[model samples]
Target: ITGGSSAVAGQWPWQVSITYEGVHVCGGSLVSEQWVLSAAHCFPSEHHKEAYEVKLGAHQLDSYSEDAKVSTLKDIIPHPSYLQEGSQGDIALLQLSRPITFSRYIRPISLPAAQASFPNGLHCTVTGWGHVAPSVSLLTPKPLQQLEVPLISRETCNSLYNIDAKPEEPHFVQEDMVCAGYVEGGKDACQGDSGGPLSCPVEGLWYLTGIVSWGDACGARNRPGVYTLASSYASWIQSKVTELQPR
Candidate 1:
C-alpha cells in the first residue's frame, strides 16, 4: 500500500509539492496563491537561506526539475502555541513570496462548512510523497502514495493515551482536532506524511478536513494516525491571513 499510485496526485490540482535543496520534501494544499496549509513540523529546523521552496502544480515528485510550477517561501508561520510533542498546534502556513499562476493541475481544496461535524467511522484519504516503505531508507525514490483510514471515537482515543490529554481541555480534542484511522492499525500516516491532507468528500466537494500530525508509532497495532482538525482553526486561520495580506 506504500508504493505505486497510493498517493492521490490526481485528486486535486491545488495540491502542492514542497521541496528543499532540490528534493521533494512533502506535500500541501494551496489555500491562496500566497498561502499554503501544512504541518508546522514541516518547516525546516534550521533556517538556511533558500531552504524552502514549493511547487504549485506537480504530478510526479521528480518533475520539479522539469514541469513543476515553483514558488519560494516568503514566510513560514507555525501555530503560536505549537508543541513539539503530542503534535499540539500541529498546523502551519507557508507564505509564498509571490503569487502562483493557477493551472488545471493546481487548485485548492474547499474548506468544510463551519460547524461541520464529520462523525466517527467515516473513511477519509491521506496522501503524500513521503516514505512508503517501513524503514525510511527503503522508501520509493519518487512516486507518491495514498491510503484510506477511518475516523475513531474521541472516548476511545483518550483511553488509549497514558497522558493527561483530556478531551475537555482547551487544548484537547475540541471540534478542531479530529481522531481517525483504524483501531487495530494496519493502515496509517507515518514517517513521511507530515503536513499532508486528511481529506473527505463533503457536500459534493473534496475538503481538506485534517492535517496528518502525530501517532505513537508507524502503523502501530490499535493506534491510528491523528490529524490536526482544520475546522476548529477556521477563524484563526482566516484572521491571520487577512491581517498579513498587504492592502
Candidate 2:
C-alpha cells in the first residue's frame, strides 16, 4: 500500500508473497497450513505450477531470510464467476505444494464469519510489498509495508463512483467489493498489493475482512482502494477448503 511505513519483521505472519518465475507479482494470506487466499486476477494467464511460488515469513522482498519458507504451487482455483474483463469475483484459493510448519513468523489468519459485520470507519491494516509511487516504472521490492485505513461504506463509495462514472459505464464498486481508505486520499493499496489481506481486529482477534482487489489509482483523492469482501465469500471459501482437503 502507498504512504505506508516499513513493517517490522514478523509483524504480519499471514502475509505471503506470490512470485512468478522468481519475481514478486502479488500478495496473499495464509488461511491454513496448506491453503492461501488471494485475488484471481493475479493469475490471469496459465503457467506451469513450477513457475509459481509462495514465500512465507518474508520481511524484505529482495532479501533472503532464514525464517522464510518457499513452496511451489500445487493447484490454483479461481472463483467460478471471476471475470478478468470486468474484474469481478476476483477471489482465488491457492494450494501450497506441501503443508507449512507454523512458526512465530508464519501462521494462519482467521477468516470472518459470513454474517460478520465490519462497519464503516473501522480501522484496519493492509500490508504488502507494493510500489510506493504511481509513476514508478518498476515494482521495487522494499521491506514489507503496512498502512492503517478506515473502511468506507458502500453507499459512499458508490456515490463517489456515480459522480465520476459515465451513464453507460458500470459502477466502480460492486456488491462483493468493499472500500477502504480516505476520501481525501494520501493512503491506499498500490501495484503488487493485490490479493493481500485487509485485516480488522475484533474481540482481540484479527479477522481477514478483505482481499486487496483493485482501485482507480494509488492514494488518489476520492478514489479509495476496493477489495473483495471476505465475509461475503466465507461459505465459498470454506467449501473449497473442505473439498480440496488432502486425501
Candidate 3:
C-alpha cells in the first residue's frame, strides 16, 4: 500500500496480484490452495472473467520464480449481498485454475476464526503492490510493499469519517467494514491495493482480518482505509469454498 516499504522475498507468502489482461490491478491473498480472496470490484464484468488472472507466490509483480504460478480464473464469486454502488460487501472469492503448490514462498493465510476479536487500535499489517508513491502517484511497484496500521472500530471510525453528507444511518462506513490507518494519515492502503489482506497477528498466528475495501485519497488525514471484515464472512466463505472449489 502507499507509504509502505519494499517487502522482502517471501515475506508475505499469501500476498497475490489480481491482474486484468496481464496488468496488475489490485492485491489479494491466497485463502486456500485453489481459492483466492479479493475485492468484488476487481472483476467488474463477472460474466466475462476470462481476461483476469491471479498470480501467487511472488514478491515482485513481474519477476519470475520457480514457485510462482499464475492461475487462470475458473470462477468469480462476489458476495451475494454486495451492491455495485455501495461499499458494503466488497469482498469476493476466486477459484484458481489449479491447486496451488505449497512452498516456502507460497502458502495461504488462515481466515479469521469465528471467535476472532481484534481490539481497537491493535497493530496490524497491510501488504500490496498498489500505488506506492501516493503523492507522486507511482503504480509501478514490482516488489511487494508493506505498512503497519492499527485497527479502528466502527464507532470511532464512523464518527471520524461520516460527520456530514448523507443523513442515512449507514453513511460512508458500513457494518461489514473495518477501518485502519492514522488520524494524521501519511500511511495506508491506496488506490490499487483493493482486495489485499489486512493481516493481524493473533498469538503468533496471523489471520486474514480484513480485505482492502475503500477510503478517501491515498493516506488522507482522518480517513483511514476501510476493509471488508473477514471475520464476518467466515461461514459464507466456508460454505462456498466447500461447494465450488475444484475437486
lDDT of each: 0.68, 0.85, 0.82
Shift in Å, residue 72, candidate 1: 1.0
Kindly report which residue stretches of model 3 are placed more than 4 angstroms away from their true locations once superposed: 135-141, 163-171
Report the CA-based lDDT of candidate 2 relative to the real structure.
Answer: 0.85
Q: Which candidate should be chosen as best, given TM-score against the real structure? A: 2
| Tens-digit lDDT track of model 1 for 64-87 | 434457888888888886766555
lDDT of 3 by residue, 1-247 (tens): 6778888999889999888878778888998888899988777764468888888888777666777878887888889888774468888989887787878988899998655789898899999887764645444447888999999987788887764435653447678888888887678788778899999988998999999886535876777888888888888898888777534
Reference-based TM-score of each model: 0.83, 0.93, 0.91
- Weakest 10 consecutive residues, lDDT, candidate 3? 132-141
Q: Which candidate, 1 or 2, would have the higher TM-score against the true structure?
A: 2
Rank by lDDT, descending?
A: 2, 3, 1
Error of 1 at 110 (Å): 1.4
Ranked candidates (TM-score, high to low)? 2, 3, 1
Please give, for residues 78-108, the per-residue lDDT of candidate 2 as tens digits: 8988876346788889999999999999999
Shift in Å, residue 175, candidate 2: 0.9
